[PDB]
Design a protein around this ligand. Structure first.
Ligand SMILES: [K+]
Ligand SMILES: [Mg+2]
Ligand SMILES: [Mg+2]
Ligand SMILES: [Mg+2]
Ligand SMILES: [Mg+2]
Ligand SMILES: [Mg+2]
Ligand SMILES: [Mg+2]
Ligand SMILES: [Mg+2]
Ligand SMILES: [Mg+2]
Lengths: 339, 132, 49, 223, 51
RNA sequence: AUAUACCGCCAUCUUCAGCAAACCCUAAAAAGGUAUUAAAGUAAGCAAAAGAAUCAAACAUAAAAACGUUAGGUCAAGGUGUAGCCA
């Protein structure tokens, strides 16, 4: 009957079955389609031609009249529309490039773009955002039982010394990305780089149960660090460094501990001011030539810094063990792609 | 819970028109009636026949102006005259509306044996009362 | 012609029998219908008034 | 043209005491107002011991020599900020002096917030006040503790926004986050009235100096 | 690999600008094949051209 | 055939007071965020409220009642996904 026919919106609503107990039960799937997409008003299976609706009302100065296409002409038009349907369908099929992070199925190390503009049109196009962890935490609730939130840890940096991190939590992953990305721009540390490519000195620290041992390295050494540290180092702009991470591999403690150490380092200019002496550099590729890298801002002292006969430094067995001639692991200093 | 003619809340991104926003209990309070005939007045006959004509006239206009209707049509019966007042989007060219008006009027005048007129008010786009 | 005459004219020319009178046709002065906009509290320099 | 603007804004920073704030106060003046009286030794904060002259039978005494030096710097900074047309907000939660501090801000021409401080006032200013709200350029904390004997929320939140803070710190307060701490008595009415007068005279002098500096340089342009 | 994907790239001793990209500017050491990802055939060809 | 694929139209908690969106804060955050003589919370939407109905007035009664809970009820109002019959 003509009176039991329902609209397209109501037909797809039921057939798709999105709303219902199935959705909460985690239940490829059918895809909605628009059936008026290619249909032209005035075009029918019979092939009639209606002047002023589906054909020109006047042609070459002649007022057109009603007509019908021949069986051959209509069959062409029907087949042509069938072709146009295939073209549109193919578009959806195409899958295009993205870049994987540390692994193909993980979000870690994936660039998600710059943070959003600021209040007064403050663009952050020079900043890049990287994901460091995506977690699906759960909170038990009486109404919903197990409820899921997406906890995302991201880092941002302009590759020129300024970087920051934040955590964003939401029920939807896309929202957690926005929250973390725009929150992290409010926590920008500035990290001091020696000559723009490395840290000023070795850095050893423990943050909670995570241990980090960074080492200053010469040019061309590259980044030889935890994949997360490589991600953050590129955001900061460090090009050559070594690092080792031990203890717990907690991603938040590693990021908090990394920024803690990198922000509390001491530039050569600072050291000259604290002690009042010149800071001189001796490279083995430049011979005995003394290189003065920082001179005290105020008054140069005349008391030589005390040089003990035997220093009381606390040495790490891991650093010393190598120089003692002990065999390293088979996994050490393997050939790896350029970082 | 009552599910009748109620466009339910989403996350503030669902545009709804004035007609859609108001639930059935606001009929005769905040929103009026889409059809106005004398067949439901006391001591009057032919309610069933006026109601059946309305159902068809609404399905006819949806198909005859597919995707061009901004809101539900308003049917006004005076004497034997029928008047259809439809808000229509400006999607189709102007001359096409003149064709569909001439066609839909003549066809419905020879189907119900009454003078039927179509009144079209064109809107640039659907009017949104509120976002729910 | 006054506000009282206007309300009477609109009620004749646009008869509405909706019970709630906020939902009826109205041709009122913009001051009555439009809520008073709170003025900006700071100047061009940005110093609150 | 460009030279005149540079003269107005850059010349004031070439003099150690451009506004002559040194004359407003003296160690004797501070001692009259009981600015050297601190809380009992039990209430002492560890970060206040540098500023404490000693313990007179249980009551910590505040060195008025350090107070004079620090107060000179704080008043000097508050004047240059006022000279450059910056926004200054007075903040306190002591209800005995709520009306006096609001009256001072009105006299100076500046702003006062002596009421309950809403969480996010500075870290969420755009939402609370509007998209283009200009935040204070300096916050003067006549009292740095709230009424539960905890640091005023605006001390930490003003550092988060990188806003300098001139605060009166007593022997039980935490001066670590105050940019320009002024060690002194915060409870006595005579001490608070002295500080309120100093900040009001200082701000009015700086605003008057700006008008005179602009008139002189402006007049030179035609002349 | 980087060399094979672009046919116009040619590993020749005269094409020094290409060869420079496969030598460390600071240490002057030829990068091992995993470093740039070139296949072993082209790495041997590059090493001979650089030499 | 399957209400354990759904639409539609409802029941129950319920005349219960919450729900969800954008933010902000935490020596890290799985989550939490109130004190009025106020101590980190904020400002919009939905519900409640208000208003309308029972033809003065009030009160009362109706109506209204979000998000969810019960894979609650209904493939037999009608429609419909998948599977099935077509002498
Ligand atoms: K159902
Ligand atoms: Mg894979
Ligand atoms: Mg005190
Ligand atoms: Mg069910
Ligand atoms: Mg009930
Ligand atoms: Mg009433
Ligand atoms: Mg109600
Ligand atoms: Mg069941
Ligand atoms: Mg059953």
């Amino acid at each position: 009957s003509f009176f039991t026919k329902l609209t397209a919106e109501e037909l797809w609503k039921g057939a798709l079955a999105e709303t219902g107990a199935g959705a909460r039960k985690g239940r490829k799937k059918k895809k909605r389609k628009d059936l008026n997409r290619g249909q032209i008003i005035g075009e029918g299976r019979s092939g009639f031609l209606w002047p002023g609706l589906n054909v020109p009302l006047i042609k070459s100065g002649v007022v057109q009249n009603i007509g019908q296409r021949s069986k051959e002409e209509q069959q062409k038009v029907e087949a042509t529309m069938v072709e146009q349907r295939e073209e549109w369908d193919r578009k959806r099929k195409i899958k295009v490039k993205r870049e994987r992070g540390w692994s193909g199925n993980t979000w870690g190390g994936v660039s998600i773009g710059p943070p959003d503009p600021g209040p007064n049109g403050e663009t952050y196009e020079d900043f890049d955002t990287r994901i460091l962890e995506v977690r699906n935490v759960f909170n038990m609730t009486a109404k919903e039982g197990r409820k899921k939130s997406v906890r995302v840890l991201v880092a941002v940096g302009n590759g020129n010394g300024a970087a920051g991190f934040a955590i964003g939590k939401a029920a939807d992953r896309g929202d957690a990305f926005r929250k973390a990305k725009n929150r992290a721009i409010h926590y920008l540390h500035y990290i001091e780089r020696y000559e723009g490519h490395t840290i000023f000195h070795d850095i050893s620290l423990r943050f909670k149960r995570t241990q980090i041992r960074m080492k200053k390295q010469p040019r061309g050494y590259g980044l030889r660090c935890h994949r997360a540290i490589i991600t953050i180092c590129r955001l900061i702009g460090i090009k050559d460094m070594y690092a080792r991470v031990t203890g717990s591999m907690n991603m938040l403690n590693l990021t908090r501990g990394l920024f803690h150490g990198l922000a509390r380092q001491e530039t050569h200019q600072h050291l000259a001011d604290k002690k009042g002496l010149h800071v001189v550099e001796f490279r083995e590729e430049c011979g005995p030539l003394p290189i003065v890298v920082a001179s005290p801002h105020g008054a140069l002292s005349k008391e030589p810094e005390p040089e003990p006969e035997v220093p009381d430094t606390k040495l790490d067995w891991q650093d010393v063990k190598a120089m003692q001639g002990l065999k390293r692991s088979v996994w050490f200093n393997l050939k790896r792609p350029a970082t | 819970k009552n599910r009748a003619a109620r466009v339910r809340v989403a996350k503030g991104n669902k545009p709804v028109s004035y007609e859609e926003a108001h639930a059935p209990h606001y009929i005769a309070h905040r929103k009026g009636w889409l059809s106005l005939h004398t067949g439901n007045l006391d001591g009057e006959d032919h309610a069933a026949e006026r109601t059946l004509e309305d159902v068809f006239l609404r399905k006819f206009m949806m198909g005859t102006f597919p995707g061009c209707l901004a809101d539900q049509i308003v049917l006004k019966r005076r004497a034997n005259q029928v008047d259809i007042c439809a808000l229509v989007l400006r999607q189709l060219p102007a001359h096409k509306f003149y064709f569909l008006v001439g066609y839909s009027e003549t066809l419905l005048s020879h189907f119900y044996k009454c003078p039927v007129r179509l009144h079209l008010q064109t809107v640039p786009s659907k009017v949104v009362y509120k976002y729910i | 012609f006054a506000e009282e005459d206007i309300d009477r004219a609109i009620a004749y020319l646009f008869p509405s029998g909706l019970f709630e009178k906020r939902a009826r046709p109205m041709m009122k002065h913009p001051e009555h219908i439009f809520p008073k906009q709170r003025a900006t509290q700071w100047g061009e320099d940005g110093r609150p008034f | 043209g460009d030279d005149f603007q540079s003269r107005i804004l850059d010349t004031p920073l070439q003099h150690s005491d451009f506004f002559n704030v040194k004359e407003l106060f003296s160690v004797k003046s501070l001692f009259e107002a009981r600015v050297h009286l601190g809380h009992k030794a039990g209430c002492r904060h560890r970060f206040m011991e540098p500023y404490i002259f000693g313990n007179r039978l249980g009551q910590d005494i505040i060195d008025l020599d350090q107070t004079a030096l620090n107060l000179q710097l704080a008043l000097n900074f508050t004047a240059h900020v006022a000279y450059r047309k910056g926004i200054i907000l007075f903040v306190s939660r002591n209800r005995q002096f709520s009306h006096l501090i609001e009256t001072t801000a009105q006299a100076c021409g500046e702003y006062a917030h002596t009421r309950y401080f809403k969480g996010g006032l500075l870290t969420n200013a755009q939402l609370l006040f509007g998209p283009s709200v200009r935040l204070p350029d300096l916050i003067i904390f006549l009292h740095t503790l709230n009424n539960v004997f905890e640091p005023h929320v605006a001390v930490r939140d003003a550092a988060k926004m990188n806003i300098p803070t001139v605060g009166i710190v007593d022997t039980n307060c935490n001066p670590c986050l105050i940019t320009y701490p002024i060690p002194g008595n915060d409870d006595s009415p005579q001490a608070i009235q002295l500080f309120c007068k100093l900040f009001r005279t200082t701000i009015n002098r700086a605003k008057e100096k700006r008008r005179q500096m602009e008139a002189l340089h402006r007049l030179q342009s035609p002349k | 690999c980087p060399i094979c994907r672009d046919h116009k790239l040619h590993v020749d001793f005269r094409n020094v600008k290409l060869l420079e990209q496969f030598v460390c500017a600071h240490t002057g050491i030829i990068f091992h094949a995993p470093y740039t990802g070139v296949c072993m055939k082209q790495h041997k060809k590059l090493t001979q051209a650089i030499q």
